[PDB]
């Protein structure tokens, strides 16, 4: 009756949920649809409230999901998650904490912001749910960063070092191997669980990422929340929202998670659509003020948990589009983040992968995580690097000869090894040791 008791219990727990059911349901009325944003009246609700609009199918009464993005004190401004075609003037409206599936059940699965399966499999067995909205973890009661997080990417581990709970940026552009780099980490990063939020990414690229990048290797240790570019911006934000919530829970179980948010640009861009629809002027770049209230909020959720706890180490991709730094999101990203991995277009077009700008990149937690003997080696690596890329031309003409410049001389002697050290490959893993020991084969000891 081990199994039998499970069943009876399952049943018993439902009968107790009956007590809860609402005696009465209040309806409002949809007053106006002239545009994407709808106006309803008769029920008063908080922002973010999920509001249902009733559409008559004939004998069937279908429900159109909708959400509260604003109001005039008497009117409620709703935005739809789907098409309102077939809704009647003065249609009925009502409000339905929304529970979402959380747990080891999610591993190996592909879900949307709603929590619905995208892999063509049944909903996960939901023993536990949660709410998107969770009281923000108080950083007062969390723990500092003492531990290197092995990212399995040699250049990062050795040159830009990250550690558990650190929240890092990834700045890049189309075609520099961003998607792959993330895959490599999702596969090689040493962590208990990998959460990958894919927000605003193209539909077909989401499939490419899951089938051919993450692989079965990393697909199995990963939970993938996907809100593509076709859906409503509300659903994209939910995607990042749900992705973070999951990782948060997993953290509360003592797990160490890698949280990949692709992308923070899209999250932001999704808020902009919504903000503009409700008539919030574009104050900063033509990006409304809310966009910059949002990014901090979503990023602060990541971090290390209670001591002897578990953690969320994150990577928020920012798409730096064309030669840039004009972009405010990339700035807001820089301001709220622990440092960033910068992908070089020049390197990518040179076949140098992953194309990571050791100059542009930084990790502020690095010096705290490594030995001064190591940290010395680090600086040198960059200086040698920098020496080479500025003067790389003259060497070709045969212009340079030894004795004039100590760095460029050393650097150019080490170049094939440096170049080889920075380069990794899609299936090539570099552990913590592998990376460190690789450093010695060059300089020390």
């Amino acid at each position: 009756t081990t199994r039998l008791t499970r069943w009876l219990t399952a049943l018993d727990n439902f009968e107790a949920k009956m007590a809860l059911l609402p005696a009465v349901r209040r309806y409002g009325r949809l007053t106006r649809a002239t545009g994407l944003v709808l106006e309803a009246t008769g029920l008063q609700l908080p922002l973010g409230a999920t509001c249902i609009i009733e559409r008559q199918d004939g004998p069937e009464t279908k429900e159109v999901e909708s959400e509260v993005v604003g109001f005039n004190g008497q009117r409620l401004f709703l935005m739809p998650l789907e098409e309102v075609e077939g809704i009647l003037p003065g249609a009925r409206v009502y409000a339905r904490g929304k529970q979402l599936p959380l747990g080891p059940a999610l591993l190996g699965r592909v879900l949307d912001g709603g929590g619905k399966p995208l892999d063509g499999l049944p909903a996960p067995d939901t023993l536990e749910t949660g709410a998107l909205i969770t009281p923000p973890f108080n950083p007062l009661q969390r723990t500092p960063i003492e531990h290197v997080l092995d990212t399995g990417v040699r250049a990062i581990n050795a040159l830009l070092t990250v550690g558990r709970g650190q929240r890092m940026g990834l700045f890049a552009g189309s075609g520099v191997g961003k998607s792959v780099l993330l895959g490599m980490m999702a596969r090689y990063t040493r962590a208990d669980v990998i959460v990958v939020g894919l927000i605003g990414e193209r539909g077909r690229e989401v499939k490419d990422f899951i089938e051919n990048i993450l692989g079965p290797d990393g697909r199995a240790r990963s939970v993938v929340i996907a809100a593509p570019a076709d859906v409503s911006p509300l659903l994209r934000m939910q995607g990042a929202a749900y992705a973070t919530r999951i990782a948060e829970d997993f953290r509360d179980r003592g797990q160490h998670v890698l949280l990949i948010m692709d992308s923070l640009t899209r999250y932001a861009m999704a808020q902009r659509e919504i903000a503009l629809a409700i008539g919030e002027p574009p104050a900063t770049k033509g990006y409304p003020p809310s966009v910059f209230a949002k990014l901090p909020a979503l990023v602060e959720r990541a971090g290390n948990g209670i001591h002897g706890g578990g953690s969320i180490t994150a990577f928020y991709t920012v798409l730096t589009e064309g030669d840039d730094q004009q972009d405010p999101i990339a700035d807001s990203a820089r301001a709220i983040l622990d440092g960033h991995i910068v992908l070089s277009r020049r390197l990518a077009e040179a076949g140098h992968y992953p194309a990571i700008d050791i100059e542009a990149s930084i990790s502020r937690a690095m010096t705290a995580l490594i030995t001064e003997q190591h940290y010395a080696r680090v600086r040198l690596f960059k200086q040698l690097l920098s020496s080479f890329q500025r003067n790389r031309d003259l060497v070709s003409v045969g212009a340079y000869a030894k004795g004039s410049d100590p760095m460029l001389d050393k650097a150019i002697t080490l170049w094939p090894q440096l170049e080889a050290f920075l380069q990794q490959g899609i299936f090539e893993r570099a552990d913590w040791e592998d990376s460190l020991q690789a450093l010695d084969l060059i300089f020390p000891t």
């Binding site: 199994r3 499970r6 069943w7 399952a10 049943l11 439902f14 949920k17 009956m18 809860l20 059911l21 609402p22 005696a23 009465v24 349901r25 209040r26 309806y27 409002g28 009325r29 009246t41 008769g42 029920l43 009925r92 409206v93 529970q99 909903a123 067995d125 939901t126 023993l127 749910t129």
Partner: protein, 135 residues
């Protein structure tokens, strides 16, 4: 070798059964629900005791409808409710109608602004959801 993938099936077989535990329990709930569904439809009853209490609650629920509010109950609950609360309704300015499609022991209040839905029809939907968060 044998032990390698002959255990595969063992634990694959274990997982499959565990998978049904929630499906099978749920299936069992569905059986009781259909029965419940049957008894509800099966019977009328002469006690508005609970219905009369809900209407009392509705009358005092805020915000108040100015929209020419009308309370509707099944013609079978109608005469009795009309007597008990029919004075109070008029005091609140509500009017009463029979609605053939409401089940006994439940009601709806309708105004221009919106509705207070006390129908057992909607309470059933609410119920089924509690049982199947999928729907």
């Amino acid at each position: 070798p044998i032990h390698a993938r002959m255990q595969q099936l063992v634990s694959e077989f274990q997982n499959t059964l565990d998978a049904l535990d929630s499906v099978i329990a749920s299936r069992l709930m569905q059986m009781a629900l259909e029965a419940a569904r049957q008894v509800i439809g099966q019977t009328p009853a002469v006690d508005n005791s609970a219905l009369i209490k809900q209407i009392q609650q509705l009358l005092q629920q805020e915000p108040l409808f100015s929209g020419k509010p009308q309370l509707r109950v099944h013609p079978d609950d109608l005469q009795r409710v009309e007597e008990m609360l029919g004075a109070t309704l008029s005091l609140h300015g509500w009017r009463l109608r029979g609605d053939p499609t409401l089940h006994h022991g439940g009601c709806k209040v309708s105004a221009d602004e919106g509705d207070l839905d006390a129908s057992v029809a909607t309470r059933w939907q609410e119920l089924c959801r509690l049982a199947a968060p999928g729907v």
